[PDB]
Amino acid sequence: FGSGNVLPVKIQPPLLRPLAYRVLSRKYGLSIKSDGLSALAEFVGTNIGANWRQGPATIKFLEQFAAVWKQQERGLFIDQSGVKEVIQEMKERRDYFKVINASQQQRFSYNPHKMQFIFVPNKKQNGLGGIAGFLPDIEDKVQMFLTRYYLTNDRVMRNENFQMSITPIKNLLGRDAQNFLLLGLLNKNFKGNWSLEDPSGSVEIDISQTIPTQGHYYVPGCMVLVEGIYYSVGNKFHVTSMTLPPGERREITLETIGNLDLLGIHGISNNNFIARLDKDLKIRLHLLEKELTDHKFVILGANLFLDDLKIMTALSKILQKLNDDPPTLLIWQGSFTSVPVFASMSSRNISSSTQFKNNFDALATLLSRFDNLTENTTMIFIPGPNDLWGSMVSLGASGTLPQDPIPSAFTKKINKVCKNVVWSSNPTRIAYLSQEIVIFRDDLSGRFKRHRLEFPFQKVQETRKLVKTILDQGHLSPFLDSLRPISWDLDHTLTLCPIPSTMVLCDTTSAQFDLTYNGCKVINPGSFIHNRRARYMEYVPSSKKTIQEEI
């Protein structure tokens, strides 16, 4: 705040504290600590020449120091940071974008009694966790599906059409007739019979004369709306109709939840208070469309193999063109190995972990050539089924959904050759200004096709069916714990109660598509190489996309 005076005379704070006290402690603010007072002596002594008898200068300085403490939350006591806020003041006279992993995402529970979300303190911050702090507690296993049921039932009960209403199952124990609307998990009992389950209880289900609503998938492990008649001669709910819970747009969903900063980039929330913000959204929507079409981030075709030579040559040819106009973000996705890497008892050949390391060293050679792409592009690394830690147990199969990033030990100098590189979990959330994008990599179509209810009674239609099921169920894993185990405390990562604005859903078993639904956009990159053709697609935050091919 100005310079060029004679020299910084040194004076003791005793002759400075009365003015600061009257301006701060009396009127607005308080707690000028002794160390903070000594800190506030240097900057006022920088322009000390001909002052303490002057006019506005000191008062305006104290006013400006108060401006930070009204703006930032800070606290009460003034400490050695007092110079740190004046650095911000002189600062005053893209950004705000992040990539959130599964582990670093904030946790929020839901109270059905209160219709509201309650914060959960993270165990990493306060718990010691020096030896075992990531491990969940058994109580989460008991509430894992109860949390899903509560979220879906709230949405079903707030729909416009419903006001027959959904009845708890145990309310059917004495009735011999009438109709009921039951909502619950569809599964198989320990006896092998199809059944429906809600927190109240369970009931067996008869499909012998069921007429389902075509247009979506009926896989065990998902919420289903059902209608029929209950017979007390046995215990059977004879079904006459079957559907899935309706979906809800995020604009109508946000108002119910207020303005909670779930993926909070505005700020953070703790056990004391939560954060909301509305006025900034308009101006940042303005900035999103303020002639920023130059931003360009690219998702490559999934499942690219580094060990193969033709794939590496095709990637070099693709980066040749990417060098010309550097993408804003470049997301390398899919399994980076063509074979699962396991303990490899045979040591006659070179170890598979060392081979994994070596295959990540050729990337440095191929990438160091293109200096501009290093200089002004950020790369996002998505894991796959055959990466290091998972394949040590699953041996190439698909297991736990929250998949940890690639270890930093076997990939070390790719952080040097490239400028911005971030490793991310299998499900991740890119927060770009007023936009949330979800990155997910698995084969969904095969598992849907294999597991269907099969009621006793052009290929792009399957894509619409998959999109509708995934979006209406509001969850990325419409499956029981048997088909796919889930980390108990990380399940909130996989629940889409607010529908994401943009979705990255790659499946090698499903053809590429571009669909729109209730307030979102779903794109499907897949099969990096196909029919001797290497494909990769571009997407722009202004909701336009392009497909670029290089044999």
Partner 1 sequence: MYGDLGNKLVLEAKRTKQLYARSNQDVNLPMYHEDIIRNILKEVSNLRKNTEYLKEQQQLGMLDDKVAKCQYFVTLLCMERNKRCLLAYQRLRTDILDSMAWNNNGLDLMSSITFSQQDTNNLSHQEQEYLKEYCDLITDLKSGDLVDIDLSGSLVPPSDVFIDVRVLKDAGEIQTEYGVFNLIKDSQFFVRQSDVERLIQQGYLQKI
Partner 2 sequence: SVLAAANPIYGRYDDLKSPGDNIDFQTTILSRFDMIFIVKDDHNEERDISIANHVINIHTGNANAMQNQQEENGSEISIEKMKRYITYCRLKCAPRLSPQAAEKLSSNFVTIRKQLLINELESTERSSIPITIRQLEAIIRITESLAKLELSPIAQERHVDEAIRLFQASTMDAASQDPIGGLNQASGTSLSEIRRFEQELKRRLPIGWSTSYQTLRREFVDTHRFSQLALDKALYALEKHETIQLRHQGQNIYRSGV
Partner 3 sequence: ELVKSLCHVMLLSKSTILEIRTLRKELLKIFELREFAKVAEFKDPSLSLVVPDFLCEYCFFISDIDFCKAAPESIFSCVRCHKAFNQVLLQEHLIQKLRSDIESYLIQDLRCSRCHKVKRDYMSAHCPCAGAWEGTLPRESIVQKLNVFKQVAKYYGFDILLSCIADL
> Which residues are at the interface with partner 2 (CB under 8 A)?
168, 170-171, 173-174, 190-192, 200, 482
Q: Find which of partner 1, partner 2, partner 3, none residue 174 binds, CB within 5 to 8 Å per kind.
A: partner 2
Q: List Cα–Cα distances, 38 to 82, 213, 458, 550, in angstroms.
A: 9, 75, 76, 65
Q: Find which of partner 3, partner 1, partner 2, none residue 88 binds, CB within 5 to 8 Å per kind.
A: none
Beta strand 194-198 pairing with 201-206: antiparallel
Name the minimum Å distance from CB 198 to partner 3.
7
Q: Which of 76, 233, 343, 409 binds partner 1 (CB under 8 A)?
A: 76
Q: List Cα–Cα distances, 104 to 264, 378, 386, 415, 424, in angstroms.
A: 12, 20, 23, 21, 10
Would you say 37 or 262 has its CB closer to partner 1?
A: 37
Residues in Cβ contact with 282 at an 8 Å cutoff, skipping those fewer than 6 apart: none
Q: Which of 272, 408, 458, 461 binds partner 1 (CB under 8 A)?
A: 272
8 Å CB contact between 261 and 281: no
Is there binding between residue 80 and partner 1 (CB under 8 A)? no
Q: Find which of partner 1, partner 3, partner 2, none residue 197 binds, CB within 5 to 8 Å per kind.
A: partner 3
Would you say 76 or 132 has its CB closer to partner 3?
A: 132
Q: Which residues pair with 230 in a beta bridge?
A: 237
Is there binding between residue 145 and partner 3 (CB under 8 A)? yes
Q: Which of 18, 174, 192, 234 binds partner 1 (CB under 8 A)?
A: 18
- Residues in contact with partner 3, counted by CB under 8 A, come to a total of 43
Say which amino acid occupies 471.
L
Name the minimum Å distance from CB 56 to partner 3.
56
Location of structure tokens 């911050």: 125
8 Å CB contact between 264 and 106: yes
Would you say 83 or 115 has its CB closer to partner 1?
A: 115
Residue 373 burial (C-beta neighbours within 10 Å; 0-12, 13-18, 19+): buried
Name the minimum Å distance from CB 207 to partner 3.
20
Name the minimum Å distance from CB 236 to partner 3.
19
Is there binding between residue 258 and partner 1 (CB under 8 A)? yes
Cα(330)–Cα(167) distance, integer angstroms:
49
Kindly tell me the sign of the dihedral angle through the C-alpha atoms of 381, 386, 387, 393: positive
Name the minimum Å distance from CB 11 to partner 2.
53
Q: Find which of partner 1, partner 3, partner 2, none residue 37 binds, CB within 5 to 8 Å per kind.
A: partner 1
Is there binding between residue 348 and partner 3 (CB under 8 A)? yes
Binding mask 178-217 for partner 3 (x = CB under 8 A): -------x-x--x------xxx--x---------------
Would you say 171 or 354 has its CB closer to partner 2?
A: 171
- The two tokens of residue 23 are 């301006």
Would you say 84 or 141 has its CB closer to partner 3?
A: 141
Q: Which of 392, 397, 547, 551 binds partner 3 (CB under 8 A)?
A: 392
8 Å CB contact between 514 and 502: no
Q: What is the DSSP string of 365-407?
A: HHHHT-HHHHHT-EEEE---TTSHHHHHHHTTS---SS-PPPP
Say which amino acid occupies 408.
S
Cα(7)–Cα(15) distance, integer angstroms:
18
Cα(155)–Cα(163) distance, integer angstroms:
12
Angle at 523 between CA 471 and CA 398, to 5 degrees: 70
Is there binding between residue 133 and partner 1 (CB under 8 A)? no
- The two tokens of residue 43 are 């900057």
Q: Which of 135, 277, 281, 547 binds partner 3 (CB under 8 A)?
A: 135
Which runs of E-coded beta strand occur in 444-543? 502-506, 514-517, 520-523, 529-530, 533-540
Binding mask 25-44 for partner 1 (x = CB under 8 A): xxxx-xxxxxx-x-------
8 Å CB contact between 217 and 455: no
Would you say 103 or 241 has its CB closer to partner 3?
A: 103
Name the minimum Å distance from CB 258 to partner 1.
5
Tell me which residue of 100, 236, 218, 284 sits closest to 479, measured CA to CA: 218
Residues engaged in binding partner 1 (CB under 8 A): 17-18, 20-22, 25-28, 30-35, 37, 73, 75-77, 114-116, 118, 258, 272-274, 276
Which residue ranges make up the site for partner 3 (CB under 8 A)?
131-132, 134-135, 137-138, 141-142, 145-146, 149, 185, 187, 190, 197-199, 202, 342-348, 351, 353-354, 389, 392-393, 399-400, 404-405, 407-409, 480-481, 485, 487-488
